[PDB]
């Protein structure tokens, strides 16, 4: 038992991280087979990143303007192209550590692990969710651009996120691995801001099931509610609506605990209307929304990856 | 910016995890050079683990009673011995993935990363602290015995923890890598229980500094206090005493924020006496004590590992 915000083992991704330098900008790249992926704003300078034209900036570059460092070895760039907001740097060596991988785009509400990197060297790993407003509440400093987010499904790394920028509220925005931003953010230095967020209702319910599984039951009650009457309460507390597909996804957890999904919604209603009254759930005094039903089954049942 | 509970990249440790089977018990082992380390209770059976004599149990075992699985390869055990509560299984192959490593024993209050494993396959990574009562609040199921806790200092893995058991409150107990338990726990199935815990004061203060660095300042005040008058409040709220060495360790963070350590203690006093009044700090409605001053400097400055 116990419940922790748990990331995937990062080894398979560590072997893909490299350092990309262009001009006086250094950031991280992702080396798979003979391609290095990195944020296109690497080709910009301080006065470029105000309002850049990336097609213009890139045509003025040469293969030799890109320095790729794989640990303490020199990768020769033999080609370069832009794909949306990422650069693809063709190099003369295939990464021998290339795992089986996919490029997938995730939904707000889903989670992934982040391997934060600086100068191509991995620094730490942690678990994030894609917020409903398409930002992520990450932990990122100067130099961290190009760190990636991923999930692991058996032996295959599904890359879903590459870091590009920090917004004024301290949250982070980036792209999928085909270079398409999550949310309405652009890789240029405007006054852009996050925009209003919501709480991920199905995840909160999943985490309440994790708490029951781990022995926290004080918030349970004999009450029930209808889906429609629950969603009225959700809207007022800026939770997002619960759908029948969410109820279905919570079925296994419902079955395992014997607590009907709509019964747990009634528990959530009461928590939203009364608060917790000085008590905690799974070591938190807040309702946690960054665990999916999958994450909970994973950790409260024990699946591995090879 | 941002602040996350961040673990070390796990790759260097993933390459050391193996599966150890003896009888009908399977758990995890740690393979360094030509030795596999694992909890000694692997040699016990259901009726053995009540009150075992491990010297008796081990003399009745042979090298061939230990099955060591390194992925999908067979390691031949060529020797076995007991060192306190761990077994050392001499195998006929040195682990080619052996990192530079040390065996260190940590202090309550210090943190480490855990690579939870099942059947020798790594499942997830997360960050824990050694509680003042020598337990850890981990996330561990059947089969997870022998997963290890570690820190990384540049390229060298300092192993500090190997998992042995879950206590009735759902918290976890284990040993250092020389087999000596943390705390007053034994690898036998008694009625043993955690014992009373305290909050790690210096860590809370460090985390308050992380919050200031990240823009949370609402809990700051013009008040100050003396170390003695702070420690009077700490005792009443079951925080542990703050020492002058703690004040010194918090110096860099103090300097960086311009908030004197004793000023931040006065802020902590007020938080303990008034609570937070519906506000949050770094996304928490509780005072967090599982980040050390080092962890905070690490994440709010950006050190890597190679
Ligand atoms: C990458 N290592 C770094 N981010 C950038 O360099 C991007 C890049 C340039 C500015 N930028 C930013 O993240 C923002 N800028 C913005 O315009 C904003 F707010 F997103 F709209 C700054 C935080 C630097 C002002 C362009 C082309 C958008 C990076 C990544 N994560 C965190 C972080 C923290 C501090 C400095 C740089 C950071
Ligand atoms: C290892 N994979 C497993 N732990 C054990 O097998 C140890 C081992 C036997 C019993 N044990 C336990 O962790 C406790 N037993 C206790 O006696 C206690 F509470 F610690 F005092 C049980 C939780 C199984 C009752 C001995 C020799 C102490 C393990 C490790 N982590 C979690 C976990 C959860 C469920 C089952 C087994 C678990």
Domains of chain B, earliest start first: 1-14+100-197 (2.40.10.10), 15-99 (2.40.10.10), 198-301 (1.10.1840.10)
Q: Would you say the C-alpha torsion B39, B45, B49, B54 has a positive or negative sign?
A: negative
Q: Breaks in chain A, named by the residue before each, with C–N above 2.5 Å?
A: none
Q: How many Cα atoms sit within 13 Å of B186 on the Cβ side? A: 11
Measured in whole angstroms, the distance separating CA A8 from the mean position of its chain's CA atoms is: 12
* Residue whose tokens read 């110096």: B251
Alpha carbons A200 and A208: distance in angstroms, whole number: 13
Task: Please state, in angstroms and as integers, the Cα–Cα distance from residue A187 to each residue in A50, A52, A115, A165, following that order.
Answer: 9, 9, 21, 8
Alpha carbons B79 and B89: distance in angstroms, whole number: 6
DSSP 8-state assignment for residue B34: T
Cα Dmax for chain B = 69
Q: For helices B227-236 and B261-274, what crossing angle results, to 10°?
A: 30
Task: Please state, in angstroms and as integers, the Cα–Cα distance from residue A289 to each residue in A61, A206, B120, following that order.
Answer: 44, 8, 31
Per residue in A273-302, is it b (16+ CB within 10 Å) or e — as a string? eeeeeeeebbbbbebbbbbbbebbbbbbeb
Per residue in B236-248, is it b (16+ CB within 10 Å) or e — as a string? eeebbebeeebbe
Under DSSP, is residue A267 helix (H, G, I), strand (E, B) or coil? helix
CA angle A300, B67, B41 (to 5 degrees): 60
In angstroms, how far is the first alpha carbon of chain A from the final one?
Answer: 23
Mutate to test the pocket of ligand 2, among B23, B166, B179 (most ligand atoms within 8 A of CB): B166
Which residues make beta-bridge pairs with B156? B153
Q: Which tokens sit at B125?
A: 């990574």
Q: Which helix (H) or strand (E) holds B268?
A: helix B261-274
B265 is catalytic: no
What are phi and psi for residue A13, nearest 5 degrees?
-85, -35
Alpha carbons A48 and A210: distance in angstroms, whole number: 48
Question: Which residue of A lies nearest to B282 if distances are taken between CA atoms?
Answer: A137
Alpha carbons B13 and B148: distance in angstroms, whole number: 9
Alpha carbons A30 and A38: distance in angstroms, whole number: 6
Residue B129's closest CA among B290, B297, B244? B290
B64 is catalytic: no
Alpha carbons B265 and B242: distance in angstroms, whole number: 9
Residue A219's closest CA among A260, A252, A264? A264
**Resolution of the structure in the document, Å:** 1.8
| Contact between A92 and A76 (Cβ < 8 Å) | yes
Alpha carbons A266 and B236: distance in angstroms, whole number: 37
Strands (E), A45-130: 67-70, 73-75, 77-83, 86-91, 101-103, 111-118, 121-129
Per residue in A161-176, is it b (16+ CB within 10 Å) or e — as a string? bbbbbbeeebbbbbbb
- By CB atoms closer than 10 A (0-12, 13-18, 19+), residue B263 is middle
- The sheet with strand B86-91 has its strands ordered as B73-75, B67-70, B17-22, B25-32, B35-39, B86-91, B77-83
β-strand A156-166 against A172-175: which pairing, if any? Answer: antiparallel
> Which residues sit with their C-beta closer than 6 Å to ligand 2?
B 27, 41, 49, 140-145, 165-168, 187-190, 192
Residue B162's closest CA among B84, B93, B109? B84
Measured in whole angstroms, the distance separating CA B253 from the mean position of its chain's CA atoms is: 24
Which ligand gives the minimal distance to the CA of B186? 2
Strands (E), chain A: 17-22, 25-32, 35-39, 67-70, 73-75, 77-83, 86-91, 101-103, 111-118, 121-129, 148-153, 156-166, 172-175
Q: How many Cα atoms sit within 13 Å of A48 on the Cβ side? A: 17
Q: Which tokens sit at A282?
A: 């799974």
Which residues make beta-bridge pairs with B120? none
Q: Under an 8 A CB cutoff, do A141 and B286 touch?
A: no
| Contact between B274 and B267 (Cβ < 8 Å) | no
A vs B: CB pairs below 8 A: 155
Which residues make beta-bridge pairs with B80? B89
Residue length, chain B? Answer: 306
| Contact between B163 and B147 (Cβ < 8 Å) | yes
């Amino acid at each position: 038992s116990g419940f922790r915000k748990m990331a995937f083992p990062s080894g398979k991704v560590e072997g893909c991280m490299v350092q990309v330098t262009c001009g006086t900008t250094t950031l991280n790249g992702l080396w798979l087979d003979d391609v290095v992926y990195c944020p296109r704003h690497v080709i910009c300078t301080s006065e470029d990143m105000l309002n850049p034209n990336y097609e213009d900036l890139l045509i003025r570059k040469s293969n030799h303007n890109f320095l790729v460092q794989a640990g303490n070895v020199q990768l020769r760039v033999i080609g370069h192209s832009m794909q949306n907001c990422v650069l693809k740097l063709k190099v003369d060596t295939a990464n021998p550590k290339t795992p089986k991988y996919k490029f997938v785009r995730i939904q707000p509400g889903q989670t992934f692990s982040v391997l934060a990197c600086y100068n191509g060297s991995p620094s730490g790993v942690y678990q994030c969710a894609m917020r409903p407003n398409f930002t992520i509440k990450g932990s990122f400093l100067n130099g961290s651009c190009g760190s990636v987010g991923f999930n692991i499904d058996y032996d295959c790394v599904s890359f879903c996120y590459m870091h590009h920028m920090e917004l004024p509220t301290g949250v982070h925005a980036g792209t999928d691995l085909e270079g398409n931003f999550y949310g309405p953010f652009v890789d240029r230095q405007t006054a852009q801001a996050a925009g209003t967020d919501t709480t991920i209702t199905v995840n909160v319910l999943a985490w309440l099931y994790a708490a029951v599984i781990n022995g926290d039951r004080w918030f349970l009650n004999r009450f029930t509610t209808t889906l429609n009457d629950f969603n009225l309460v959700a809207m007022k507390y800026n939770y997002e609506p619960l759908t029948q597909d969410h109820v279905d996804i919570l079925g296994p957890l419902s079955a395992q605990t014997g607590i009907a999904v709509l019964d747990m919604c009634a528990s959530l209603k009461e928590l939203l209307q009364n608060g917790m009254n000085g008590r905690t759930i799974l070591g938190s005094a807040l309702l946690e929304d960054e665990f999916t039903p999958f994450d909970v089954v994973r950790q409260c049942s024990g699946v591995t990856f090879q």
